[PDB]
Design brief:
about 30% strand; mainly beta; 1 chains; 5-stranded antiparallel beta sheet; globular; two-stranded antiparallel sheet; about 120 residues
């Protein structure tokens, strides 16, 4: 999981992003996708049932007091939910991986957006 005071809910609009690399490629489909900019106050944690982990301090990481969180696919179903300037937590059914929301991982397609391929904290 992680907590973050998000302050920009970007545009669920049609852009052009990457395409799965190396193998048979296709058109950079004009995907109605989006992202968000969210300030950080405490980083990742541990799924501690009734408790949580410790909110990791961003002090040792001057880069991106905020974070660039992207949305395609099923994430589409959260566009309306958030309202910027408010704090939200992301919980994750999946293997633990701190140092998470700074650069693209490996547990999905290596598809990166037009300008936020690795821009700040993709």
């Amino acid at each position: 999981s992680r907590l973050f005071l998000l302050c920009h809910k970007e545009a669920l609009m049609k852009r052009n992003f990457c395409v799965p690399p190396g193998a048979s490629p296709e058109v950079p489909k004009p995907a109605l996708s989006f992202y968000v900019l969210g300030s950080w106050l405490g980083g990742t944690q541990r799924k501690e049932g009734t408790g949580w982990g410790l909110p990791e301090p961003q002090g040792n990481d001057d880069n991106d007091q905020k974070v660039h969180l992207i949305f395609f696919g099923s994430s589409v179903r959260w566009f309306e939910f958030l309202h910027p300037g408010q704090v939200y937590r992301l919980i994750a059914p999946g293997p633990a991986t701190p140092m998470l929301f700074e650069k693209d991982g490996s547990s999905c397609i290596s598809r990166r957006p037009l300008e936020l391929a690795g821009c700040a904290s993709c």
